[PDB]
Design a protein around this ligand. Structure first.
Ligand SMILES: [Zn+2]
Ligand SMILES: [Zn+2]
Lengths: 392, 135, 135, 30, 51, 28
């Protein structure tokens, strides 16, 4: 009935919301609430059909490659297993968590919520994990990666669409529609109903875990979930600065150390991101452009945007507040797509696997690249725009 | 804290993969080579009758005493029969008279052939010059 | 704050990487070549008994005096024994009528073989025409 | 509607049946 | 009576056959006959004549 | 900004091209 914006602390009465459209903050125009849409039974049915479809969308080969008279069948599991067997277990695990593990966690969370309704078990942290797992469930990014890799290796060998590609595309569509029609605030209010306020109190706080506006209890925790309720984050600026510095430090090895080692006819190329993007611009510039803008343009843009936002916070500048929030939203929207390079190199090293004529391997820089991407994503997520609004 | 759930799952699955790789690694065996012509420190198979078992992990020099220390990780199924009379040799794409030799070696790179016998135990061996007759 | 520990760990990992790079590209050595047929300025191994140690980093000409100045980065383990009597030669895939040796060079491109002795110290060497006998 | 999950279930059943139909047998050679 | 053999890219002086094996890597050739049933076989040394 | 980064990349490419451009020689 009445809420406060989690981004600019605008205290406003929220009218009743139908299934059509949604609501937004009057000041900053931020997505605040959703209504109606699908139900928990439909979510459980989607989780069940995903559980049925995922093993046959993963184990089955995505596409068949005829290279040098040899037919090779490859898939996500083969790529990740090759990554772990080479020695880059952390890169293999992060790719696995991004691609395969995150839908598994989503299905497990849906089943856990259903069984909690059936039995009576606690369901508080599972809802927070479900809310924050949408940024990490990435299958369309892997679809773009396999498309890019197929276009890249179209000239090297012969590519035929496999049976597993159709199931993978169906899984991508199902996960996309389920995540788009999955509502977390509705689930929170259904599972743990609460009460609204008198539309004007000027003493309400917004929980950053469940988007509930209200008064903290005598223990200082949120009434809806068992986390403390504060005005802002505890150490938002310190966490953002630490993650930004870590990503800045780790970006240098990702570009200096070689990213791809190509054994051609017994000789290794050992080329970094810059050399690879230069060769790809020389050969197949059409996909080199998207690879460039998704591999090196996005991370540095995010780094400089976060650095300028923190400098504006320190300086208490009040000139471009209308544009800084838009830039932050754009960075939040675009930072998820920086993981395309890891998926592309995983699929290419799974496909091109000749013994000595053509052996593509991932060098000791993709770990630093992925760590930098994860750290800058965490920095963007941990940055609190209410500090930007209070800088005035 | 409730927010420590998803990072816990990520750390658990990462440690599971690391533990799987460590279990599949094996034991380290040191071999002295006179000349490692094409042993890649990253990928070099160690085969018994052509079946890949071991993998070269480390390459170093014995303080420039004309000997190359090669550390190879060997699986447990071969460790159970790894004995003192175990012989290793380097298969390279050399050409010989009256027909060529090692065409599979030419296709798949320089590698190390091995042959066990009836010794007691040893972890430090010296490679032979050529492939011996084994019958 | 516990989250402030992550950039420190990243920084110390980067410092270890800087140390590793300084060890791998240990020191620059200048060699005079009469003809560098296939030395790539980016990737050209310098091997002792086939074990890659050095890497060619720079190529220039001695103001067109029929000599090529090749700067090679050599690791510290070889720098510790890099002495005045150190010989270098260019292994190429020569396939002339008299000799057809050099199949390893044909497979892996062109590289630089090295052999030390019992000199005092030197940083500027001149490459030999062919591979000398070393026993 | 439930038509989309019904179609997904039908496709999953079809691919499971296809997988179970044509699995080969294991033969051991020395 | 099912026979299996390993086709490899042998290029000895006497015989240079095996170009298909050289192109597509080492493989296993097979030849059946008129036996009853078996699941455990022993490979032959070379490829036998089958007519 | 994306346009600023693209302009910087184009300027870097132009500088790299101009640093080692040499001279054009015609051979029959
Ligand atoms: Zn707002
Ligand atoms: Zn809450």
């Amino acid at each position: 009935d009445y809420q406060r914006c989690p981004q600019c602390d605008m205290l406003f009465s929220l009218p009743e919301i139908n299934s059509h459209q949604s609501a937004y903050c009057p000041r900053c125009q931020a997505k605040i609430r959703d209504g109606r849409d699908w139900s928990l039974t439909r979510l459980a049915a989607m989780a069940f059909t995903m559980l049925l479809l995922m093993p046959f969308a993963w184990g089955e080969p995505l596409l068949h490659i005829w290279l040098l008279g040899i037919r090779i069948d490859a898939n996500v599991m083969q790529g990740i297993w090759q990554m772990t067997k080479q020695g880059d277990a952390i890169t293999g695990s992060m790719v696995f968590f991004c691609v395969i593990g995150a839908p598994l966690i989503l299905v497990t969370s849906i089943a856990y919520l259903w069984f909690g309704n059936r039995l009576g078990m606690n369901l508080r942290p599972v809802l927070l994990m479900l809310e924050r797992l949408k940024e990490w469930v990435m299958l369309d990014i892997y679809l773009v990666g396999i498309g890019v890799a197929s276009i890249k290796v179209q000239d090297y060998a012969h590519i035929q669409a496999g049976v597993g590609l159709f199931s993978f595309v169906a899984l991508v569509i199902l996960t996309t529609v389920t995540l788009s029609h999955l509502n977390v605030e509705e689930l929170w209010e259904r599972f743990y109903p609460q009460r609204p306020a008198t539309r004007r109190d000027e003493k309400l706080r917004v929980c950053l875990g469940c988007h509930f506006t209200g008064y903290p209890d005598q223990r200082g925790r949120c009434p809806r979930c068992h986390i403390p309720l504060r005005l802002r984050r505890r150490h938002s600026l310190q966490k953002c600065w630490a993650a930004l510095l870590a990503s800045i430090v780790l970006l240098l090895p990702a570009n200096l150390l070689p990213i791809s080692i190509i054994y051609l006819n017994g000789g290794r190329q050992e080329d970094t991101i810059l050399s690879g993007i230069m060769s790809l611009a020389s050969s197949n510039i059409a996909v080199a452009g998207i690879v460039f803008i998704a591999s090196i343009l996005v991370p540095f843009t995010k780094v400089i945007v976060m650095f300028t936002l923190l400098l504006s916070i320190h300086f208490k500048c009040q000139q471009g507040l209308r544009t800084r929030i838009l830039l932050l939203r754009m960075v939040t929207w675009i930072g998820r797509w920086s993981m395309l390079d890891l998926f592309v190199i995983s699929l290419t090293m799974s496909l091109i696997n000749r013994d000595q004529i053509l052996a593509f391997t991932m060098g000791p820089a993709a770990f630093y690249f992925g760590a930098a991407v994860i750290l800058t994503i965490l920095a963007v997520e941990w940055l609190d725009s209410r500090l930007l609004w209070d800088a005035h | 804290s409730p927010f420590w759930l998803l990072p816990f799952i990520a750390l658990m699955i990462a440690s599971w993969l690391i533990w799987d790789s460590y279990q599949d690694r094996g034991n380290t065996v040191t071999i002295d080579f006179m000349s490692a012509d094409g042993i890649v420190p990253g990928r070099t198979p160690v085969r018994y009758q052509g079946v890949e078992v071991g993998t070269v992990q480390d390459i170093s020099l014995s303080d420039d005493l004309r000997k190359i220390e090669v550390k190879v990780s060997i699986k447990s199924d071969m460790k159970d029969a790894l004995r003192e009379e175990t012989q290793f040799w380097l298969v390279t794409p050399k050409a010989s008279l009256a027909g060529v030799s090692g065409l599979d070696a030419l296709v798949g790179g320089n590698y190390i052939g091995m042959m066990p016998g009836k010794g007691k135990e040893q972890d430090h061996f010296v490679a032979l010059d050529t492939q011996p007759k084994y019958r």
